[PDB]
Amino acid sequence: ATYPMQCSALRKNGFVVIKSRPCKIVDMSTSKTGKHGHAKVHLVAIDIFTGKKLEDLSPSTHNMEVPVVKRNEYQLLDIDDGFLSLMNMDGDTKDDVKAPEGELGDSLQTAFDEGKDLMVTIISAMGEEAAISFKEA
Amino acid sequence: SIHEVVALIEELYSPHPKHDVNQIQQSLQSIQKSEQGFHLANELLSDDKYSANVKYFGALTLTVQLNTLWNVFRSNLLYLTKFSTLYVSNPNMYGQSLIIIKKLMSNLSLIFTKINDPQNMIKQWNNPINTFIQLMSVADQLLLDSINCSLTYEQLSQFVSLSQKHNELALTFTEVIVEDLTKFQTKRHSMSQIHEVVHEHLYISTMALINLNLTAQAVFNPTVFDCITAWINYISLTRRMDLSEIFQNLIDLMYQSTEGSDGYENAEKILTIFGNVFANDPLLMSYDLRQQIECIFLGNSWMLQYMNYLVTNDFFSELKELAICIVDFLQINTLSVCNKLFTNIQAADNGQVQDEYIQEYIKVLLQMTNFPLTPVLQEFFSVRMVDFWLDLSDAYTNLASETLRPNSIELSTQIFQQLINIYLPKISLSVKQRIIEEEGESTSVNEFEDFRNAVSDLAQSLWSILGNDNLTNVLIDGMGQMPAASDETLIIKDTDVLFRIETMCFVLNTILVDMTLSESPWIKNIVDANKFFNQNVISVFQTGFQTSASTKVSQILKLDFVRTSTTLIGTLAGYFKQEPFQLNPYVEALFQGLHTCTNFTSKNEQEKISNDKLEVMVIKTVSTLCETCREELTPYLMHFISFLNTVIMPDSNVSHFTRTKLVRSIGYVVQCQVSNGPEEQAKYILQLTNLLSGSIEHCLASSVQLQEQQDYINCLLYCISELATSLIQPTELSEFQSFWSSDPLQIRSKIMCTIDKVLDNSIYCKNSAFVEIGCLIVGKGLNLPDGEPYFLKYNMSEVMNFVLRHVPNCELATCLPYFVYLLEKLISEFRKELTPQEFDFMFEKILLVYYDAYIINDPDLLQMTIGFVNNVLDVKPGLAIGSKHWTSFILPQFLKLIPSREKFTIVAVAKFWTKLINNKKYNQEELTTVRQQVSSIGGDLVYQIMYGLFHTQRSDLNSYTDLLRALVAKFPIEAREWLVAVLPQIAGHEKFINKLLITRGSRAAGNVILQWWLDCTTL
Amino acid sequence: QVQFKLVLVGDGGTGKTTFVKRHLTGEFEKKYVATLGVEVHPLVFHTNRGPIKFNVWDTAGLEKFGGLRDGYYIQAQCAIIMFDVTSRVTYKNVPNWHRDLVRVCENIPIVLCGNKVDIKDRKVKAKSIVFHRKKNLQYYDISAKSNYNFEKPFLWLARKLIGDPNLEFVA
Ligand SMILES: Nc1nc2c(ncn2[C@@H]2O[C@H](COP(=O)(O)OP(=O)(O)OP(=O)(O)O)[C@@H](O)[C@H]2O)c(=O)[nH]1
Ligand SMILES: [Mg+2]
């Protein structure tokens, strides 16, 4: 689910665990107190699910958790009481994923009520799964 | 009697008729359809001496065919007869006679839909256009039989176009038939095969006729444009119909349309057609034609010539529609542009031939995004481009990490920073200044605010890409490294930098809202590196607040500067907690303005409403700062309470809203005084309680309450509510618990007796506002996390005696939902200690006694009672099930309320039975009793469902589906037993749903249900 | 004394009868009574240029109770299409009612009205409306319960039918 990686090797685009939450790093800064003193990296990131801004300042050679972000495609077959019942290409149905909010969920309930074929790209990081992107042919 | 019919028909359309319009209308509905109504209509149309309005009513009287198989044939003959009659009088010289022409088209379209349905007989029409063609060739009644179903070729169809009105009638006929098929498809979906009939015959004739209008010059008529859009709408709603060559010839026609040749009239109509396709169903156009659209829009070039024609002639509305069409076209290629830009997974490799094409592609898009001619007032390209760049930002954020280009972050930073440099002067307040100067207080101001809100969300999506140093630090260092006002009192004196700093303050605010300034040390590092940042922020507030409003433009801009400044100060409350010494200059600057808008009484004359808006925005920021900086604002507590004692006086120049938020601000500071123990903090709480309750009792017993005293008492009651909410411990010990449980200062006793003194007056108890705020204060301590030492936490007997006290003397219509909602809070709080006998006591006193008189005939009180029972089922079903009125009152009453005529009442009753059936919190004994009771009233229940489902119409079918799904899933065996009895009462075809619905089980009903409603509706 | 003919159309349950009753008697009807046929009522507005009498024809949105259904549109001088923002079906049928009006009349001023804006859960966003791009078409968010934008539709119709955009109802 998560793997350790040195804070100095953290990318400005990759993902990292901050305050037990997966977050996509939006900017990476490094600072030093003294020339003989050790440095420290200051990371700022957007929460990959809630969208909140989380940041952490930690010294170098320190290990940070990096989550395994997966983007999967499921055809939307039902919307039951705010829960997206999707269909995998292998024939399995997942109704545990809730319907997203905002214009994303509004466009999902709109296109699903119209009857069009809807594919949903869902992002699973650590223990949370939520619909992200939509595709129609 | 026909002369009498024409008399009241002409009387119906007269400007000021005699006797009555409603009665002659009802009498007109009485003449039809009866055995002479059909014949009356034919005589109204065959007579040439009748007026056009009388003949239109004849076509309307013909339209009533819903009242067996032979009368349809006898009608369609006379439809086509009166058709050919008026359609021959048109093309020579009649004018303004095409109104009845269109109505007869609508009637024939309904005939085409009804006859071509599955069910001596009649064979399908298949093609009304051809039948209309040969009817213009004049042993007599025998012609219509063979002309109907089989007709001539296309060469003779072109021969019909010898005149112009002939082509107009054919174009209008195809349009009306399509538009009616669209209305019939949108109304109810029982078609499924008529589209195939249109696809096999009518589609060919319309495409050959439309393409003939596009290719041939003499046959070309501008009416085909309105006909193409109609066909495109019908195709976009149903489904392969090509339309590819139509788009090709429309592109050739649009490109040929210039100022000298056509005057850009056809180009405008074709752009409206393309704008409809791109905005609704862009996939209807193939990739090749979209490539031609790209080369025409983006290219001297033809698009540049048309844009210069609109700009030089000052045609801003048509230029706005042009921007909408181009943006909607580019929005469908968002994923392709984002991929070919920032990722390496595309068609071509090792070029890079597409990059220099796409680097110029984005460069031209940025030139169009900038686009001279200031926004809203003139152009909308930048306004609509906001949604395009927003989709590109979300697409870039959604790209995979391993698929990004090496220069992806650099190219994204460069492009999106140029967007910031473009849109910052775009949302500049100088644009709104010119809008209010030129157009005044028009809708362009509202569209400019929507433009600023759209760019605000654009920046919120761009921050995840540019980051803090490339987006946030650019704004902070831009206004933090230079002083906006060198002279004291912070007067900018300069308009350009004032607009620039207000734009930067608005964008910085919307970006910082998405942050958390407490957990972040970065905000302290960037602000400490800017000496004049906070000085310039207060400079914006003081410059706008102290700006004298001479005209209406300076007045509205004054409200805008204060709004942006006060909002940013409220957002910086987290940074003020990290940097307390910078908080002092803000509080003084706010209270100085708060006094500036208080001690002055010059009101000529609507300046007080702008004064009140400023006073509201100031006290809102003070409430926001006190909400986060409760601890840092402790030294100001002794000053604020003193200031409160002067504001709470009945004689003052402050508004009632600022009084409430001030008490909320003082309560925010008192809430953080839990250090020295409950005794020192209760000194402030008792002082505020005695001040609020003392002023209430002072106002009630001296100056007999008028409308002014009602607003003052309501203000102080809301102040007690704000004090109760502000004293709630934030979600972000036993000494306070034992103290407030005993409350030696009698805080709850003084507040409760104060609310009682207000609600004991007849002028207040029957007012909904005082009952609403009364139930809010009493229910403040309810549903709070246990263990929190809340001061105003009331037990069950106190809230019970409160509702029982004021419910009989109040107005039951408007004040009951507040008492019931207060009861729902008490039920959820004391769910552990509640007793079914106590639930019956609340149900009888508050609801049952007032039911048969005030509730049963009131929809609001009805949904109120249903929502109350649903809350009990959600919290503790054992209270409602073990009720004495469960089987005697609750079940029979809610059974009758199933086929209600109100939508919200339907959803309320449907949710009740759905929760009653699908409840998972039932005990094993409770589940057996529920299944027993549902089986007892199941027959009556399913009858009420189908009764409501039959008598209802669209948009309320789904609310029944969720109900029917649960009843079939939980009781599948008795479902058939209850359907075979309820269906024939509410014909034989209904049995079809039984097999098809129970087979599904759940999750795809409704689709089976409306195919039953569609059947059982026509009959 | 100048009068104009107003035709009020829309799907059933959009608050058409409640809207005209709120402007006539000032009362809000809570119960839903489906209008049978048409109901024509006068509404007087005293503006700076005198009195204006709008003959408002509240039509029936239901296919069953429609009555003449389009005979009410004859000699119509202005029209108001009303939909429900809480019901998407009511908004998708706006082009249907607009088409039946453009079939009878040609360029009469038509006002679009999304009712029940006071509802917290709104299923029709204000940004989705693109029908206000026409000179004779204008949209207004109205609420018959809270009187939000109460006299706005009648004011726009008065400005189009007269030609004085500075005229307002201040009576
Ligand atoms: N909350 C809320 N409810 C409203 C509002 N306006 C109307 N309603 C409700 O909507 C229901 C619709 O009533 P009608 O006016 O008869 O509906 P209609 O549009 O006239 O449709 P027909 O009667 O079939 O012609 C009424 O019972 C009102 O209670 C509103 O502004 N807010
Ligand atoms: Mg009505």
Numbering used by the authors:
A (entry chain C): 17 to 153
B (entry chain A): 3 to 69, 78 to 129, 137 to 155, 162 to 262, 269 to 328, 343 to 775, 786 to 1039, 1044 to 1076
C (entry chain B): 8 to 178
Reproduce text from the manuscript describing this model.
The crystallized export complex included the Pdr6•RanGTP subcomplex and S. cerevisiae eIF5A lacking its 15 N-terminal disordered residues. We eventually obtained hexagonal crystals of the ternary RanGTP•Pdr6•eIF5A complex that diffracted to 3.7 Å. The structures of the Pdr6 and Ran molecules within the ternary export complex are almost identical (RMSD, ∼0.25 Å and 0.15 Å, respectively) to that of the Pdr6•RanGTP heterodimer. In the yeast eIF5A export complex, Pdr6 grasps eIF5A by N- and C-terminal arches, in particular, by the inter-repeat loops of HEATs 8–11 and the last helix of HEAT 20. Pdr6 interacts with both domains of eIF5A, namely, with the N-terminal SH3-like domain and with the C-terminal oligonucleotide-binding (OB)–fold domain. However, unlike Xpo4, Pdr6 does not shield the hypusine-containing loop. The N-terminal SH3-like domain of eIF5A constitutes the larger interaction interface and sits on a concave surface made up of the inter-repeat loops of HEATs 8–11. Most of these interactions involve hydrophobic contacts and are centered on W506Pdr6 and K69eIF5A. The OB-fold domain is clamped between the N- and C-terminal arches of Pdr6 and positioned directly adjacent to Ran. Ran does not only interact with eIF5A directly but also promotes Pdr6-eIF5A contacts by bringing the N- and C-terminal arches of Pdr6 (which stay apart in the Pdr6•Ubc9 complex and probably also in Pdr6 apo structure) closer to each other.
S. cerevisiae Pdr6/Kap122 was originally identified as a pleiotropic drug–resistance protein and subsequently as an importin β superfamily member. Furthermore, we found that Pdr6 imports Ubc9, exports eIF5A, and thus, combines functions of Imp13 and Xpo4. Pdr6 is an all α-helical protein built of 19 canonical HEAT repeats followed by three helices (termed HEAT 20) at its very C-terminal region. The transport signals recognized by Pdr6 are folded domains.
